Design a protein around this ligand. Sequence first.
Ligand SMILES: O=C(N[C@H]1COC(=O)[C@@H](NC(=O)c2cccc(O)c2O)COC(=O)[C@@H](NC(=O)c2cccc(O)c2O)COC1=O)c1cccc(O)c1O
Ligand SMILES: [Fe+3]
Ligand code: NA
Length: 427
Amino acid sequence: QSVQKGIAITYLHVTDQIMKNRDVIRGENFLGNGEYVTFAGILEANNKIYTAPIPMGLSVYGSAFEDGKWVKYPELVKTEDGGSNSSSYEKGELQWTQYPNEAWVAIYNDENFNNPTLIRTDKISYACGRMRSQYYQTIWAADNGDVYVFSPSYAKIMDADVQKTNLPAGVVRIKAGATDFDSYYCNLEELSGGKSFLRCWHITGDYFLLQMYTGEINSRGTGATRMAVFKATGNGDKGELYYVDGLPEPDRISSFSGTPFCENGVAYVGVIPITADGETNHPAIYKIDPVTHTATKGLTVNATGITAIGRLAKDSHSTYVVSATVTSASTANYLLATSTLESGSVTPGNNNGFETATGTAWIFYKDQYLYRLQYNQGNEGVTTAYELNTNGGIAKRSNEYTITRFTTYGIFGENIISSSAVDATFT
Ligand SMILES: O=C(N[C@H]1COC(=O)[C@@H](NC(=O)c2cccc(O)c2O)COC(=O)[C@@H](NC(=O)c2cccc(O)c2O)COC1=O)c1cccc(O)c1O
Ligand SMILES: [Fe+3]
Ligand code: NA
């Protein structure tokens, strides 16, 4: 028995609030070159699970294995601890992949994560966005079940030339029910004016929303203050990309709220300004119409930030929920109720004061529950969940758990699923 890298999987089962730690999956040599992986995203489509196994380089175990067999670039192996935050490294590791010019997708026939089908492409680098410790999902399904695998080519900012990818940001495709790539390929940098992206989502049909970088990619996801609409089958199945018109221009935007809320063929996203002085400059929710790639200003949020947008319902009661942060001399979080995202305002206070702890990731399960996932660096994550009660008020569900540290999440079936690469002992 020895300490190896593994893939931890946590299930948050929404019907009964049960939390399950899966047996840890062996991550050493997950892709056949010795490197270990971090899952990026958990996508359900065609009754399968799709994730992107993002290579991490070699663990200490990986660089020791069979007399260093897996070490292609020994000049990159570390001889002491170093690095910072979630990118700290230890003596003997080879940090980040030696194989940046490829992407993998792992496909599972159900949520037990047994017997993956693994498919490799040379057309794109690995399929995830990166923000501090977090691995953002960039694999998404069209309405017909075709899965589009996007890569922002994050690896371009690696220090070591051999660890940089030379592939532009781009997209490939897995047709519904298939477990091979087809021939589809779109070079996104040729459509975006040379720009890449932080993360992306599905809007409707074959329209996807990309949160675009304004300049160079960076490790903190800052300055990703444009949106663009991608029509995957546009221009004779070559892809079409349009920057969104009608949002505040980038030098007014501090950040976007994160995961959009999609209904009725459009996307809603929160915009947090750099300077929020005066009501017309407070954070606000914008509606993005993918057909016209046009945004319109909607609900104003009289708070410091916006962190989630969705819908909660119970019996005949139903409301939009906007998660909003308020920073003073620390930071409070409020779940604000509204019947519209497109006008008026919401303000934390006596008639809208459901306070929660802050969260790193906010996930709506359908219109039934809101899950908060709190990231705590090297320590355990924390999760709470929220619903409408039978009176129609927002309420916290009773079970509050520490969970394995997570760096990605998604949904399959009745489970919110979260994952990260962990140390584990195996036979
Ligand atoms: O809110 C989060 N952090 C807090 C608390 O974390 C910390 O204070 C420190 N941090 C760790 O010790 C850490 C130890 C082990 C693991 C860590 O991830 C640590 O961060 C320093 O991080 C920082 O100063 C900043 N951080 C990065 O620049 C970063 C750069 C590259 C890579 C990073 O991970 C970075 O944090 C800001 O982050 C914070 O202050 C937070 C949120 C979302 C995702 C995060 O990763 C956050 O950490
Ligand atoms: Fe961090
Ligand atoms: Na360093």
